[PDB]
Amino acid sequence: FGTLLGYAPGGVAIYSAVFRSYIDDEYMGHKWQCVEFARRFLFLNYGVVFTDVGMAWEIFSLRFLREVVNDNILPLQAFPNGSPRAPVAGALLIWDKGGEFKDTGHVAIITQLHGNKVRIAEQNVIHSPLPQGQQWTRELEMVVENGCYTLKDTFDDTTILGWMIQTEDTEYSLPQPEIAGELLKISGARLENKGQFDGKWLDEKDPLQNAYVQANGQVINQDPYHYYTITESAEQELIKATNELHLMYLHATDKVLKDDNLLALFDIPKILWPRLRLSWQRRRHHMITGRMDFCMDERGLKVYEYNADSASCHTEAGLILERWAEQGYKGNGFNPAEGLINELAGAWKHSRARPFVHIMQDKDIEENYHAQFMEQALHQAGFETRILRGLDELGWDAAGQLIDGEGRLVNCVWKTWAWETAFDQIREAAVPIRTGHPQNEVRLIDVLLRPEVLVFEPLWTVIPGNKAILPILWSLFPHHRYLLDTDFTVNDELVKTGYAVKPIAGRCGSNIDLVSHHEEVLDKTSGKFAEQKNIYQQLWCLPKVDGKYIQVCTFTVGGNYGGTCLRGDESLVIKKESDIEPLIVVK
Amino acid sequence: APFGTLLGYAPGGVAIYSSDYRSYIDDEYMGHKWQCVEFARRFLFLNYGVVFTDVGMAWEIFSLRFLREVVNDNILPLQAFPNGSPRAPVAGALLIWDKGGEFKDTGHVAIITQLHGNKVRIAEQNVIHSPLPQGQQWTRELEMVVENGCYTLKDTFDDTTILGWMIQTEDTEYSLPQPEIAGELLKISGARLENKGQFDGKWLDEKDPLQNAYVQANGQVINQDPYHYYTITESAEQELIKATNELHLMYLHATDKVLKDDNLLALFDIPKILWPRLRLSWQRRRHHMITGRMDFCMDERGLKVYEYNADSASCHTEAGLILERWAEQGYKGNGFNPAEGLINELAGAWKHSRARPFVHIMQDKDIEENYHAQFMEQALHQAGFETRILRGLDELGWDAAGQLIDGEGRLVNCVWKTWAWETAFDQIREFAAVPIRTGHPQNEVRLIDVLLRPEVLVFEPLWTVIPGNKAILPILWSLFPHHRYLLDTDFTVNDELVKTGYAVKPIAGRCGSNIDLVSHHEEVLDKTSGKFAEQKNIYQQLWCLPKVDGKYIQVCTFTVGGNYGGTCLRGDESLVIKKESDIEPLI
Numbered sequence A: 001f002g003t004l005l006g007y008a009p010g011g012v013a014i015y016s017a018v019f020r021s022y023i024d025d026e027y028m029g030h031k032w033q034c035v036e037f038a039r040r041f042l043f044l045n046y047g048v049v050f051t052d053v054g055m056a057w058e059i060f061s062l063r064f065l066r067e068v069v070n071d072n073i074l075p076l077q078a079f080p081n082g083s084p085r086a087p088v089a090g091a092l093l094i095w096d097k098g099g100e101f102k103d104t105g106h107v108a109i110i111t112q113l114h115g116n117k118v119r120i121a122e123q124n125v126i127h128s129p130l131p132q133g134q135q136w137t138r139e140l141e142m143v144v145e146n147g148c149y150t151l152k153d154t155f156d157d158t159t160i161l162g163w164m165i166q167t168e169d170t171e172y173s174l175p176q177p178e179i180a181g182e183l184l185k186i187s188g189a190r191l192e193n194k195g196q197f198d199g200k201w202l203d204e205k206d207p208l209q210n211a212y213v214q215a216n217g218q219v220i221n222q223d224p225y226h227y228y229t230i231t232e233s234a235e236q237e238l239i240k241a242t243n244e245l246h247l248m249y250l251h252a253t254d255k256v257l258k259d260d261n262l263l264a265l266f267d268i269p270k271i272l273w274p275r276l277r278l279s280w281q282r283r284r285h286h287m288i289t290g291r292m293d294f295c296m297d298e299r300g301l302k303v304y305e306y307n308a309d310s311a312s313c314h315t316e317a318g319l320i321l322e323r324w325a326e327q328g329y330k331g332n333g334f335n336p337a338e339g340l341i342n343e344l345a346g347a348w349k350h351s352r353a354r355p356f357v358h359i360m361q362d363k364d365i366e367e368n369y370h371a372q373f374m375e376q377a378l379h380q381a382g383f384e385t386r387i388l389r390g391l392d393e394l395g396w397d398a399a400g401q402l403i404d405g406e407g408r409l410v411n412c413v414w415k416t417w418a419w420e421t422a423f424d425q426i427r428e429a430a431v432p433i434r435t436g437h438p439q440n441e442v443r444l445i446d447v448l449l450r451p452e453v454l455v456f457e458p459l460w461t462v463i464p465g466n467k468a469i470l471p472i473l474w475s476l477f478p479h480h481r482y483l484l485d486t487d488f489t490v491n492d493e494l495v496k497t498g499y500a501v502k503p504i505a506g507r508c509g510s511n512i513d514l515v516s517h518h519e520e521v522l523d524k525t526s527g528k529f530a531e532q533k534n535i536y537q538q539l540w541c542l543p544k545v546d547g548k549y550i551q552v553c554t555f556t557v558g559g560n561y562g563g564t565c566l567r568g569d570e571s572l573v574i575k576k577e578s579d580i581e582p583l584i585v586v587k
Numbered sequence B: 001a002p003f004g005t006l007l008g009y010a011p012g013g014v015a016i017y018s019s020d021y022r023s024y025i026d027d028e029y030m031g032h033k034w035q036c037v038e039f040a041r042r043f044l045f046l047n048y049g050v051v052f053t054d055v056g057m058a059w060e061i062f063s064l065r066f067l068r069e070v071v072n073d074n075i076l077p078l079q080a081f082p083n084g085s086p087r088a089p090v091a092g093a094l095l096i097w098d099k100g101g102e103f104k105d106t107g108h109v110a111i112i113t114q115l116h117g118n119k120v121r122i123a124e125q126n127v128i129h130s131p132l133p134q135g136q137q138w139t140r141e142l143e144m145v146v147e148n149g150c151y152t153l154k155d156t157f158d159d160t161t162i163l164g165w166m167i168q169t170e171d172t173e174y175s176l177p178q179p180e181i182a183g184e185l186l187k188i189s190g191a192r193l194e195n196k197g198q199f200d201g202k203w204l205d206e207k208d209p210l211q212n213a214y215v216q217a218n219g220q221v222i223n224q225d226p227y228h229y230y231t232i233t234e235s236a237e238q239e240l241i242k243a244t245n246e247l248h249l250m251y252l253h254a255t256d257k258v259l260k261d262d263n264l265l266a267l268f269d270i271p272k273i274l275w276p277r278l279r280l281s282w283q284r285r286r287h288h289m290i291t292g293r294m295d296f297c298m299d300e301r302g303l304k305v306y307e308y309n310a311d312s313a314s315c316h317t318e319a320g321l322i323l324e325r326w327a328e329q330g331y332k333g334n335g336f337n338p339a340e341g342l343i344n345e346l347a348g349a350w351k352h353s354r355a356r357p358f359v360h361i362m363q364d365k366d367i368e369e370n371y372h373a374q375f376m377e378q379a380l381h382q383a384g385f386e387t388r389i390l391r392g393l394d395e396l397g398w399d400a401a402g403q404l405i406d407g408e409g410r411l412v413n414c415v416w417k418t419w420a421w422e423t424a425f426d427q428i429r430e431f432a433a434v435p436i437r438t439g440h441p442q443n444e445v446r447l448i449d450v451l452l453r454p455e456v457l458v459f460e461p462l463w464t465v466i467p468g469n470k471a472i473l474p475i476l477w478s479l480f481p482h483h484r485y486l487l488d489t490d491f492t493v494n495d496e497l498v499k500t501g502y503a504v505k506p507i508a509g510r511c512g513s514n515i516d517l518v519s520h521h522e523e524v525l526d527k528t529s530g531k532f533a534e535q536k537n538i539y540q541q542l543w544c545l546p547k548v549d550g551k552y553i554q555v556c557t558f559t560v561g562g563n564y565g566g567t568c569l570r571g572d573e574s575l576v577i578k579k580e581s582d583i584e585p586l587i
């Protein structure tokens, strides 16, 4: 393991959790699989990288590479084995899962084309030192007949999907694989009632679970004997979409922070602009968790919003639903969010956070278990926490430093508070924060914006959590399959489709108005944000399944998929009071 | 309060320490703990993401006409208003003091934190060294008198002079012209020493390996008349320092702009394959440049810069040591060696480079490069590094796997090259990634097989080829039109250049090779042969060196870690300075 075997062109080493391979703070892969080599190769040689993928064969489905130096997105065309499009050096070559590559699939780099052969460089095929100075691992027979190009693999039971090239030229290239509507259908299921949820099924021995009870009782939803399922094909679409939209959202965030006209649309205090930028530039890789809201049904997959600032439901999807399973599911399926705690613990272990982080939650019994759920992650990652319930335990020394109750310094914190809240305190000649007070009255903004404090999630995360970014995403990725047309007005095309009126910095499902392509108000909610800037997002009603509208939620943990959860409501607009609906992935 | 003790915070949480006798924030140099400039610059960066260049004295800030936006190396305009100006001294502006009274010769600077119609509050660092009133975010209050539109401030001191304030804005109304220096101060004068035989035998100490290195190459000699020297006024040096820091920031801005636009970068004739790396380099090794050298024409007419040797520059030993020996040996006046601390500031930039513990020095087998290697070896040694000089490439070879190793078999991972990158680029002009060897029968390692090895960390960084290439001159002209120090440089002989006459110069040449100086009369004032005849030329406005005491003197300033590192001369019987032109003692 790890023995250096040789080098691909340009001098890219080839070898045979704590195996994460990074070059700077860019994730190359897992040591030392086929994907890690192809990614690193592309990263050291062309400054580009493809998004996270579970299996190597999932690569052949991407249609874009990211250019790191400027978070720019480039077009990547795919080509089937046997194409007029010739397989040039440096192109990605992918294998479907099958034979030698049972389930994984495979990927390598074409280092050199010939007249009757081709040389590829790759990892996890060869585990022996290569001959002095030879920069390739295998050769593959190529058949050039009638302008068409075919590659023949050295194995006898492996399908080669094709090669890929980063180019605008779409000629000879195939279309982006589109998933079957049926495979995306959500459908109800039921457990056999043997009184499995008739009592204290939630383990009250566990402090975390018990905190949940204190805030919600022994309840997940009205009927715990009923649950829903999604095909394992859907979860994969969910993983494709989550990872892909995650990059999109950042590509737009960077785009926003690069032009005062675009940033100006978010109504953030103009005094926080330079700080937004600086935060983006040095904490771009420090985001920890996020939740994406989707509509999923036979029509396809659409994104409503990306709660990137401060999300929740982690405890529910990643702990309670597990208990529910362990308590009453005897099937073969699985909870798409089972390993959320670890995913998070992972993200924390690699976050440049201080050894001792203060957890800042509000004095709401409902946040208690959320703060503790996260504290579990931080503790699993080896950090020291101290859960601050409200701003009362906070104070300043004589000089002006932030100390907690025990009297220690507060320089690193993970908040439950949304940044827009601290923003509010500003909207009343440079970030006005107190550094001392006769009564020691410390405020939220007096902590989160104290330059010396390391906050999670980062400041810039409020750009992607703000809806003013949706119209921008549309502008940059027009007619993208997961996107919904949204604008800061009701344009001609929207007036025609119907739309959702939404406050740019709202949440909980507040002040949302749903108008049809007719005139009628399909549904409306109240809220505290009825006075802020609204956006209008193309309508796209939630699917009703077994008497409840259902919205799919995935989580992002450090940029990548972290799980899926369900949310149901008797009405079209999911709200804070909505129920969590058990979900079980099936194949 | 002792040194380093925190007394309080300015607006936004910018701490104020007691400087009762160097600070960085990430990778950005802020100042020296804890001067008035260290706080002034830190305030701006933490609050506004901008910063102003390295200044010798705080009073010099008032002469600066631009700020730097760090998050994108963009340059912002900064106007200066006299104290007594219609322009009101808004909060956040810079308040600069001229040297005098309480602020003797250092001068002084502070930040206006708030206005009160009849008063103003400011924060600073090297004025009061005692804790401040719990919570008070200012250090002093000045009386602002407003009489008929004008604004005047009165400083709490009776003998000091307040220059005015500065505001980053495009509105030049009420503002001051960027001062110019009286050409008479920029004149280079000839001087002579009393001949009492100070330079007749062996004045260079041969027991010092360094000096001996110099002598084995040049003998006990610097120029043809060691008794004659030149002088410039301390004001000209200040100007020279002013210009060096300014141009350095300019070139770096021009580099950023080039690596952000393919249509520009393409004018450099750098093998495409390297583009992604050029970019990656600018991004990581942004602050890793050690030392460069600028070439100027200075005289009553003012200051012009011909080129900026940022890749590989020499003359460091001559200026910072041999001339030191010359003075210590035959000078007894009051003037000084403008380059005396090179070695010390050199060790400086190394100590703060992200350099690896053992650094291989790579020179070419030139009895002349030996002392430039060894001189640099001293700074490395002083900054605490282990070195081994490599003369030529015979000593290099590869392991069985393909790793670069030196004579004594150790790994070559870090390197300070004497070689010019273009030499390595040339080995590319003769694939699907940079064509380097990671193995070879005869174990024959080329230059490029080292500099472009991904694991090999080199100095100077790859990107420096850009500023070092003269295709940047036209770009620089384009960005900073009729700039005080720039010369009209284009890629063709445009109308204007026909009028002035111009220099024909290869974009990637050195030593003064293949230069053609044509007059407005359209005559060839001078020519030089060379090995760069066949590459792309740029044409720069003629601006002949001045002739002083029989020779033409060109001024040179060293850049070191981005800031002025000293000055030296070079004279020649011709208008063209070459590798053979001698160094002339400056004082």
Ligand SMILES: Nc1ncnc2c1ncn2[C@@H]1O[C@H](COP(=O)(O)OP(=O)(O)NP(=O)(O)O)[C@@H](O)[C@H]1O
Pocket (backbone or CB within 6 Å): A293, A304, A305, A307, A484, A499, A500, A502, A506, A507, A508, A509, A510, A512, A537, A538, A539, A540, A541, A542, A551, A572, A573, A574, A575, A576
């Ligand atoms: N374009 C749309 N078409 C149909 N329904 C929509 C649309 N946008 C939103 N909704 C519904 O409105 C709810 C609220 O919209 P959403 O974009 O999630 O805003 P939010 O208040 O920021 N969410 P959250 O932070 O989870 O509480 C969703 O959960 C959907 O059920």
Ligand SMILES: Nc1ncnc2c1ncn2[C@@H]1O[C@H](COP(=O)(O)OP(=O)(O)NP(=O)(O)O)[C@@H](O)[C@H]1O
Pocket (backbone or CB within 6 Å): B295, B306, B307, B309, B487, B502, B503, B505, B509, B510, B511, B512, B513, B515, B517, B540, B541, B542, B543, B544, B545, B554, B575, B576, B577, B578, B579
């Ligand atoms: N615009 C100009 N007008 C008049 N003389 C010039 C001009 N540009 C250059 N020269 C002269 O030509 C010499 C060579 O030009 P320079 O720009 O230093 O090129 P170089 O060969 O890259 N320098 P170097 O790397 O130090 O050896 C200068 O030192 C001057 O003596």
Ligand SMILES: [Mg+2]
Pocket (backbone or CB within 6 Å): A293, A304, A305, A574
């Ligand atoms: Mg939502």
Ligand SMILES: [Mg+2]
Pocket (backbone or CB within 6 Å): A305, A306, A307, A506, A507, A508
């Ligand atoms: Mg939301």
Ligand SMILES: [Mg+2]
Pocket (backbone or CB within 6 Å): B295, B307, B512, B577
């Ligand atoms: Mg020169």
Ligand SMILES: [Mg+2]
Pocket (backbone or CB within 6 Å): B307, B308, B309, B509, B510, B511
């Ligand atoms: Mg040069």
